Amino acid sequence: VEKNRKIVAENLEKVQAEAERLDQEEAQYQREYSEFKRQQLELDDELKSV
Amino acid sequence: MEGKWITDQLRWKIMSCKMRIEQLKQTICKGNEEMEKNSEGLLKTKEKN
């Protein structure tokens, strides 16, 4: 049971390690998309203004 | 005394072993419940991933 516990603990740890990496990636997608959104929200006003 | 002293050593050995079986059975229950919880958590995390 200690062996199985250790194996499963490593699986949970390594799977959660990917979860936190994807959290940084998704956080980065938001950080970048927010910039593209900022630009888009100006081009739409320039288009309407022009 | 040299007679009872020997049988009481055995009695203490049995009682000690029983106290250790009670401990190991609980240790396995604890280990299993921790593993079962960790397995359900891992499954949920894979699903989330």
Neighboring chain B residues of A24 at a CB cutoff of 8 Å: none
Resolution (A): 3.2
For chain B, list residues whose CB is within 8 angstroms of any CB belonging to chain A.
28, 31-32, 34-35, 38-39, 41-42, 45-46, 48-49
Method: cryo-EM
CA A11/CA B45 separation, integer angstroms: 10
Pair B41, A10: CB distance under 8 Å: no
**Backbone Cα Rg of chain B:** 21
Distances from the Cα of B30 to the Cα of A3, A8, A48, B24, B44, angstroms:
14, 15, 67, 9, 21
Comparing CA positions, the residue from B24, B34, B3, B49 lying closest to residue A17 is B49
Among all chains, which residue has been given the structure tokens 């699903």? B47
